[PDB]
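Hello forum,

I keep getting stuck at the same step: I have a sequence, I want structure tokens, and every attempt I make locally crashes halfway through. Rather than fight my setup again tonight, could one of you with a working pipeline run this one for me? It's a single chain of 135 residues.
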Amino acid sequence: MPYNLPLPGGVVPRMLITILGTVKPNANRIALDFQRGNDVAFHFNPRFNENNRRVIVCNTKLDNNWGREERQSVFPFESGKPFKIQVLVEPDHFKVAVNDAHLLQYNHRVKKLNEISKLGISGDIDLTSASYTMI
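Reply #2:
Ran it on my machine without issues. Output:
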């Protein structure tokens, strides 16, 4: 359920990425994957139903293996509703806000941000736009 947003020059501090769209009806998941070669530097994964609980799972994949998951229960998404995801890149973490409200922070595990060349956007959503700017 994939679209790739190329990031020429890679990820860099002050980069602000915005993803606008609408969650599909009866959604099961959404996923944003910042990729560095074969690795996934930052996986942002809202799960609409994990054992009857909503949860946002964040993680990193190195050497074909997922690491320690960071889980957040605050879940602002809703099936059939429009959403806005903003990811602000800082030197020490990815700062994520949904619908103009801070949601979570993910400390960098993959350190060479310049090598993170693209953001994969997938899941049960109708993607309107994916873009970025420098603040």
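The radius of gyration is 14 Å. If your local run keeps crashing, start a new thread with the error log.
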